[PDB]
């Protein structure tokens, strides 16, 4: 698969599209600084999506359906992007690094933390660059199988243009390793499991005395 002018420019645009408080009252403040980073991330993901070709042409309702369920997956991709295999930690916003223990003290439970760190380690072995990251994020956003998506067909057709662009990219990036393109997609499989381990997480917070802030509650709390 040769990369086309049209794919070149699309990829370049995505990469360019990607370019808060202190750190048992200490406990509820630590949680708060962490949820604040997520809130920031949601804003970034919206801004990013708005730039994705095809996205704003979908009905607003469909844009909500897509972001609602992809946000955590994009957050997890962004987590694995800033993983350091030396210190087994996550470097959010230049300065503040976070290990499994820091995550625990930030209010998250072990049964979420370990899968987050396993995924990040496995993802770091692939050594993805920005172009690969942006595309995976885009593919994740445009999944036609999210709950309440109306124009599945359009969402799917859109996803495949990003899937193709990835294929052709990885062909220039890894011309001798034809497995790299499928290995990257196989991470979206793992990403779905992580997405529901995050559901078990959200539900467990309900059971303790820990309320998600407004935006996060809006995307993640099930309200009935």
């Amino acid at each position: 698969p040769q990369l086309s002018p049209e794919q070149l420019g699309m990829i370049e645009k995505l990469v360019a599209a990607q370019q808060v408080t202190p750190w048992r009252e200490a406990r509820q403040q630590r949680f708060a600084h962490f949820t604040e980073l997520a809130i920031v991330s949601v804003q970034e993901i919206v801004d990013f999506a708005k730039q994705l070709p095809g996205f704003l042409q979908l009905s607003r309702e469909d844009q909500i359906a897509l972001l609602k369920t992809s946000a955590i997956e994009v957050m997890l991709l962004e987590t694995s992007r800033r993983y350091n295999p030396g210190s087994e930690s996550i470097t959010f916003l230049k300065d503040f690094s976070y290990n499994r223990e820091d995550f625990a003290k930030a209010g998250l439970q072990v049964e979420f933390i370990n899968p987050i760190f396993e995924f990040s380690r496995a993802m770091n072995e692939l050594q993805l660059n920005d172009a690969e990251f942006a595309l995976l994020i885009a593919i994740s956003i445009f999944s036609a199988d999210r709950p309440n998506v109306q124009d599945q067909l359009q969402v799917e057709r859109l996803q495949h243009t990003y899937v193709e662009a990835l294929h052709a990219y990885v062909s220039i990036h890894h011309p001798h390793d034809r497995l790299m393109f499928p290995r990257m997609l196989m991470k979206l499989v793992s990403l779905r499991t992580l997405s529901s381990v995050h559901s078990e997480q959200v539900f467990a917070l309900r059971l303790q005395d820990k309320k998600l802030p407004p935006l996060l509650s809006e995307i993640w709390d099930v309200h009935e």
């Binding site: 949601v42 804003q43 919206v46 708005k50 607003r60 309702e61 844009q63 909500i64 359906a65 972001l67 609602k68 309440n148 407004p214 935006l215 809006e218 995307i219 309200h223």
Partner: peptide, 15 residues
């Protein structure tokens, strides 16, 4: 609709 249930997300999308 989802839109009526996701005000902050909607408002982020409108700016």
């Amino acid at each position: 609709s989802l839109t009526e249930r996701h005000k902050i997300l909607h408002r982020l999308l409108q700016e």
